[PDB]
Design a protein around this ligand. Sequence first.
Ligand SMILES: Nc1ncnc2c1ncn2[C@@H]1O[C@H](COP(=O)(O)OP(=O)(O)O)[C@@H](O)[C@H]1O
Ligand SMILES: Nc1ncnc2c1ncn2[C@@H]1O[C@H](COP(=O)(O)OP(=O)(O)O)[C@@H](O)[C@H]1O
Ligand SMILES: Nc1ncnc2c1ncn2[C@@H]1O[C@H](COP(=O)(O)OP(=O)(O)O)[C@@H](O)[C@H]1O
Ligand SMILES: Nc1ncnc2c1ncn2[C@@H]1O[C@H](COP(=O)(O)OP(=O)(O)O)[C@@H](O)[C@H]1O
Ligand SMILES: Nc1ncnc2c1ncn2[C@@H]1O[C@H](COP(=O)(O)OP(=O)(O)O)[C@@H](O)[C@H]1O
Ligand SMILES: [Mg+2]
Ligand SMILES: [Mg+2]
Ligand SMILES: [Mg+2]
Ligand SMILES: [Mg+2]
Ligand SMILES: [Mg+2]
Lengths: 370, 370, 370, 370, 370
Amino acid sequence: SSIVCDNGSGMVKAGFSGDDAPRHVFPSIVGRPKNMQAMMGSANKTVYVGDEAQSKRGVLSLKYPIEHGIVTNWDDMEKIWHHTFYNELRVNPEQHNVLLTEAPMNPKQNREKMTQIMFETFNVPSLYIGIQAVLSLYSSGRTTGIVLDAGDGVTHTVPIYEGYSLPHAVRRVDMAGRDLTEYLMKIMMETGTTFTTTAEKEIVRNVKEQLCYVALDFEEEMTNSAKSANEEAFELPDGNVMMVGNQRFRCPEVLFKPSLIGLDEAPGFPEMVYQSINKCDIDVRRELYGNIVLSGGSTMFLNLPERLAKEISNLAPSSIKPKVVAPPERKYSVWIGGSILSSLTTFQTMWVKKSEYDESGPSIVHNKCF
Amino acid sequence: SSIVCDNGSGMVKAGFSGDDAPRHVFPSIVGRPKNMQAMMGSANKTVYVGDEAQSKRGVLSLKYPIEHGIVTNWDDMEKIWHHTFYNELRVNPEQHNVLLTEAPMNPKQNREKMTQIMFETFNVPSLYIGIQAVLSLYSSGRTTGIVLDAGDGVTHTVPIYEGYSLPHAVRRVDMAGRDLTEYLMKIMMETGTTFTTTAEKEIVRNVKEQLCYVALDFEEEMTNSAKSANEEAFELPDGNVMMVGNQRFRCPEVLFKPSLIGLDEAPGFPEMVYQSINKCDIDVRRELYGNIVLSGGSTMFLNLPERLAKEISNLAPSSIKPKVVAPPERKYSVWIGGSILSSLTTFQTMWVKKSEYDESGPSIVHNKCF
Amino acid sequence: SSIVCDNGSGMVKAGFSGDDAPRHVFPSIVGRPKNMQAMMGSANKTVYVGDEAQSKRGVLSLKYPIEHGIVTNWDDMEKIWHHTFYNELRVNPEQHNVLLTEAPMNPKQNREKMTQIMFETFNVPSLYIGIQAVLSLYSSGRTTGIVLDAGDGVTHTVPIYEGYSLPHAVRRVDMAGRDLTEYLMKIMMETGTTFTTTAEKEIVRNVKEQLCYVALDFEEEMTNSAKSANEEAFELPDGNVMMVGNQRFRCPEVLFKPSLIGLDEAPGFPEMVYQSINKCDIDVRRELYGNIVLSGGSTMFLNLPERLAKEISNLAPSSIKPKVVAPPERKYSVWIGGSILSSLTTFQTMWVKKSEYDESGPSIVHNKCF
Amino acid sequence: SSIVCDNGSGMVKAGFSGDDAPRHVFPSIVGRPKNMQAMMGSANKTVYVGDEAQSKRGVLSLKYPIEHGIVTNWDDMEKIWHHTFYNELRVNPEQHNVLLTEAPMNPKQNREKMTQIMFETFNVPSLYIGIQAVLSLYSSGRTTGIVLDAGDGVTHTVPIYEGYSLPHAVRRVDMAGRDLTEYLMKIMMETGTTFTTTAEKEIVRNVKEQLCYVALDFEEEMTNSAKSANEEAFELPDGNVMMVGNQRFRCPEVLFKPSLIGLDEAPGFPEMVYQSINKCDIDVRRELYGNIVLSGGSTMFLNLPERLAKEISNLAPSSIKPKVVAPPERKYSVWIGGSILSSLTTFQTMWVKKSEYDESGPSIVHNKCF
Amino acid sequence: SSIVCDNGSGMVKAGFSGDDAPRHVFPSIVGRPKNMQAMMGSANKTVYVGDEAQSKRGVLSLKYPIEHGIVTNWDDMEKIWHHTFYNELRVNPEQHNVLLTEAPMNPKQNREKMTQIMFETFNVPSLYIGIQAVLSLYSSGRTTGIVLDAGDGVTHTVPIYEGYSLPHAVRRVDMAGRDLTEYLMKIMMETGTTFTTTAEKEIVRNVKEQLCYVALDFEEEMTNSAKSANEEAFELPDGNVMMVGNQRFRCPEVLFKPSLIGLDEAPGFPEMVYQSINKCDIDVRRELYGNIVLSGGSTMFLNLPERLAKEISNLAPSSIKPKVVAPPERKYSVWIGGSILSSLTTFQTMWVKKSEYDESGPSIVHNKCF
Ligand SMILES: Nc1ncnc2c1ncn2[C@@H]1O[C@H](COP(=O)(O)OP(=O)(O)O)[C@@H](O)[C@H]1O
Ligand SMILES: Nc1ncnc2c1ncn2[C@@H]1O[C@H](COP(=O)(O)OP(=O)(O)O)[C@@H](O)[C@H]1O
Ligand SMILES: Nc1ncnc2c1ncn2[C@@H]1O[C@H](COP(=O)(O)OP(=O)(O)O)[C@@H](O)[C@H]1O
Ligand SMILES: Nc1ncnc2c1ncn2[C@@H]1O[C@H](COP(=O)(O)OP(=O)(O)O)[C@@H](O)[C@H]1O
Ligand SMILES: Nc1ncnc2c1ncn2[C@@H]1O[C@H](COP(=O)(O)OP(=O)(O)O)[C@@H](O)[C@H]1O
Ligand SMILES: [Mg+2]
Ligand SMILES: [Mg+2]
Ligand SMILES: [Mg+2]
Ligand SMILES: [Mg+2]
Ligand SMILES: [Mg+2]
């Protein structure tokens, strides 16, 4: 069959074409022990990948091969790929077509080396590398709209009008869920709870995923929370309980004002969409405003679509009624679109055969894959 | 075969690998006469080791070569080793592998000189020196847990998570059964029975081993015993009978509050475990609380595990349910774990060959033995 | 005396009439701090203009008052003017005549408000606003020719035949050095070097000004550079070194094919000149082809005049031999022409006196200034 | 006048504004007796603060109110403050302005309660709480640079460029002189000298302050010291002499590799500075490399600045020449900077008046004090 | 007033508070006739106490109620107390406060029954029982030091540092002047003079008090005395003269080596002090070495302080200079300290009132008296 592997910065989503949801979602981490093994043969493993690293994180040093959508450690990335194939999918990579995803405006060498590893190390017969926002637009079952995809390493905006790309209106900000997690971990020190190790960063990520929400009116929420002192209790793995105060709505606020983490000139979620739309031709802006698609796990915060729609409406002219489409399953929207695309009968001629790679070498994906 | 010799401060336990219990347990004492021999040839021995010294203790001055887990008299220690081999095991040390144990954070010169004596004086072919808490965890048949080992000279706490050492969470207090015996001998003077000689210290040790018990509630027990005047009779070797009052539960109480013997800042049995657990990573604390292993003869007091479990539960957060594992045979738990480890087929490459010692000299055990 | 101030989009050039070169050239930027001042009195300034903003750009947010030749921020523009007078020229504006320049076919309100600010805020006695291409033709010392001026915000083409204007043959494209800088900053992401802040945009501008060159044959250069992988090293301010590959000749290529930045229907440098010439009367085309004048800093790329002359010759009929005049000092050609014009004895009756402004109000410059 | 009180984790430094050095430096310890007073009226004191506790440490249990820059015992802290005012400065706190210091990214409640105690318990008229690194940069008489301050409880790095804060580039590691003292006390057990009581911890601290030095090449020093067995003699208070071997250069080595004390993922002295610089804007990094300021007593080890400068140069690009500024009086650099700041005529409007506290309550220092 | 009664094993010292010396010192003996009274009314007394028993010792059987500081005969002890009050002090015990002394670590029932007898049999209004070494330290007018008190039944060592007790460093050996007298009486049999009756034991005690001296070098003295045969003549009451040879310096030698009387493991005078000092904290040892206080009549031998100081200096480290304080009136040092303590105005609230005894019964002195 065909393999749809959505290698994200934080989570790896793998499966087969035609399915409605990925069958294997595990973190994109590689852990190694930081202490000598006192016993004999109990923990003989030297490298842990995926859920195994997450399970033993208390005695491991976790590492992310992908940073901001760019693979910074290729040995760990190929370890993750070997895991994803053999231990996760339990299929021979040589017998299946592999579909990969990548953020727009990534370095060319990243895609080139990814293709080289897929064709040589795993002997994949045919390969194709797509764009995450295009697949996210595919999954919604529409051919026109602007996709705001925010995952774990990068958020990008890609407008598409009736199937035609608008390459000069594509935005990209290296600010996503990992930056939010780091900011939350920093601002939790005010309450008196400091997390420093990589293992303790996962606890902060869980706090972010469970308690954080987007405030409808940040300034009003900030003042009312100051006096009422409303806070929620989060139970740490050791059994201790810590209280999370205004950090619940301050952590996702950095999406709407990235100056809180040093990105002073970064636009923010509504401003980036507005600028991307205004970079397009005047005749297509009205249909782009009326169809805004959210994707990625960093768009899953409570009240985020409503806040985004309210903020965009202020920027847009009074005759425009923006509509934000936030599917409940938008976390896996990229994988669903990739599965849909790979199941199309027209797409079967778009695969990059290994024979073509043997002829023209790398950078073949830079000409036919878009 | 292989020899598993657990040289403790008070008791020497020797045997062969594969056995379920040591075949020779005798005190680690060396006695010498303090009076001239009036008769001719009846008692021509000048040095007594082991049970012989204990049998003739009335006319001998007993000495312990090991103090607080550290050999303070090497001539007496090598006398004890010569006894343990020839008179006890009746085997040639040159034909067997010797496994030795040592408390954590001991001086390096102690282990170096022990290795030198084993390799040169006894010509042992291969040697290995382990850690008592690790072997105690081996004997329980588990790879995760925190071991509280309290013998005769020192009590130490060693956390181990899934076979990985946690060296920065290891505690060590030089307070064990010998200090309890001395405290009992001091507080028996209140009743009107003073023991001063080393021979009379063994009587106090027997009193401690037979009558002393840990009170579930020390303050309630102290008041009720004051009015009821409940006491038990202990028969001295000479035939006299002395009464032991509140000293039955006061003597082991110093384990839970070492300030009674001048160790004002020492933690105590539950506090030391709590601190050792809290020195570990937050992700491993929950599994360490749920598996606490007791070892050594000083943990054999009545109601000691129940009192320890109750005390630790107060310190631990309300979401934690500590479980204390106290095997009935925990006195020999270190030797059992050493026998199990030496019988493993993987361990056979971990012996320190005598050829290696001839090459790199001493301190070879500091690099490969842990 | 008289003041010749050439307020460009990127650079401000000021001086006095009769001089052969501007005495003060500084960027047209206004910077404001983005962080709170921790110390006391060291950096008490709140707004930085000119070279001061460029010097402290690492802690400032730089802004350009002029976009595409149109003043989009009048407060910052009047700050720049106040700087240019007092801190740069150190003369009283009330005592001198001011000569200003403006791109053709600009909005009328822009010139009206510029005149209002000059007459009211600075109390300038007499004012005149010219056209940059006319002054560029003045500086060459000729009365016939077609001027292709490309600065930082806009490129315009103005044909003049024997001193007579040809208003219906004037072209204007909002594509100049700033668009080239943005395109270079976008295409440097392929190598793996992303610049996002306004301060880092100046580094990209310096890269463009130092390394970029116009390829004689773009298609041949593109293929040969692909295989030879020829690239140059540029040292960033922090000390790091980044390699610039094919972006050296791709960045200025957008002048000859503006479709690379979304201006699909824009003509380009040779096509715009050809269309502007063909919009003129048939009797004047031959003399316009034989005298093409380049102006502005965006025409300073290596091999740009040769490439332009080759490209125009293909469009022109075979009986025409176009000649492109590219003076070495064409960056300041507008200012030189303004200085020459203001020093003419005939021009002294063309100033707009402040009394005339008090009578007819604004839009007086729309009738007598051309 | 004004009071400059630098409440550190280990040492309290107090004085008046305008002086070049603190007039009263005493340890921040509170001691209580652990034994009953046998005599009558000789030692009627029940709590000892400062040098008195240090003098009688042999019969006292010493406690540090401040841990890692955070006050963990407010009663002892206010005892220390009462001592510092009345017994040390011998002035009425109600008649003077008090300047306090605090580590960056401390819990907000710590500063709030400190302000509450100063305003209510001592009735201080006006108060101000600064940042230790900012004052350390003040004392050097420069407005640009990066300050590496390492005291007794925490080490922090604060970059400042031309007086503007860089809040997102501030690092903080809870590893300072007290952790070094604990590590030295642990590793002295290898030689055969165990210190356990709090009184004996001061002896280890004196050993660290007198004998420990930073090795220029740790690996080369470790091997050469192993064979030469070079060691120095330290005389204990009782008159005994103990030998300190490789622990002289191993104890301060944990600053450059904090994994020796369980901080496996902590950066270390050069790595923390490098990361803090690289968190800043590219335009300011070159000036931050060329001006590195050391502060605190934990930076006073021999050859520490040279080792740090060598280590940073390897991390920095080859075009960068880092310069480390280590004033001889850098132990009191924070107090000197505080005295300089409080003597400035501009600073006199920055005090938090008690009337303001009565109006807005606490957290007033969170808005105007930085 | 107040009564200071120092009930020793051999001598009873009584007096009133404020005096510089006891006004009544008599032996603590009770004698009874061993023969029938032949005459009529000449010697009608049946029990003799004090000097009367000593005067008629030739026809009486003398008995000591106190053995090793413990009252073994309460009827004789209360006879001695009745004598000491009525026949010696000639005051009503009901009208005075009584201060009593007791050796440390005595049985609790001894003190309880002493208090019961004082409160019930003699109807003493208020009572207090102190420690002999504490009072001996009081008499020297110092609050720090280590007291070596050796009387007639027991020698004990009590360190005190700045008024704070060090209970875990207190030593006690049941070997004092009576054991020396018995040893002298045994070793006088070698010369040919056997004393067996209790009356003849007093002659041996007088010989010990008049002729015995401590040898500076025992081994050198033993050899030189063997050849020179130097001996002194002692006149018995009957008029006979016996010669005392090497027994002059052998009798007090048992203090420095108690193995001569079967106390093989007893430390001896310098060893006991050294061990008691080393049981203390390291910070207080230096001041304890420099202040050693001698007390009791068994320390009155010639050259004893010099020999003790020489012996201790060998044990102490080379950096220590021990100083032994031996007041000329150290025999009554305990009584002087008791008189000083009872005259303090602060001590007046420390008396145990008879009403308190009626409420809480006995063992009240175990809580408030120390
Ligand atoms: N329910 C949630 N609410 C808020 N944030 C979430 C939620 N689930 C995941 N996230 C954030 O989204 C990130 C994962 O996004 P994902 O789409 O998996 O990224 P990628 O596409 O790189 O795999 C995590 O870092 C997490 O912080
Ligand atoms: N049944 C018992 N109850 C209480 N204490 C005991 C008991 N048996 C032994 N002990 C104490 O434990 C000590 C022996 O412990 P052990 O484990 O033999 O030490 P080591 O490991 O050094 O040989 C003795 O000093 C004794 O006081
Ligand atoms: N030597 C050069 N080579 C290439 N481009 C240059 C050079 N010098 C300046 N430029 C470009 O020209 C622009 C400045 O042109 P200028 O004539 O100063 O514009 P204006 O007329 O608006 O002041 C800059 O944005 C820069 O990108
Ligand atoms: N000369 C020295 N050499 C090495 N370390 C020192 C020296 N003096 C002090 N220290 C260490 O520095 C610490 C005191 O630093 P200090 O700046 O007083 O901290 P704080 O700012 O918290 O008062 C002590 O714990 C000590 O270990
Ligand atoms: N001048 C002396 N020289 C040597 N020993 C003496 C001297 N005087 C008394 N003694 C010894 O000291 C003992 C008396 O000591 P004392 O302090 O009275 O004891 P207590 O404190 O029990 O009353 C006697 O047994 C005697 O042997
Ligand atoms: Mg994704
Ligand atoms: Mg043991
Ligand atoms: Mg211009
Ligand atoms: Mg400090
Ligand atoms: Mg006495």
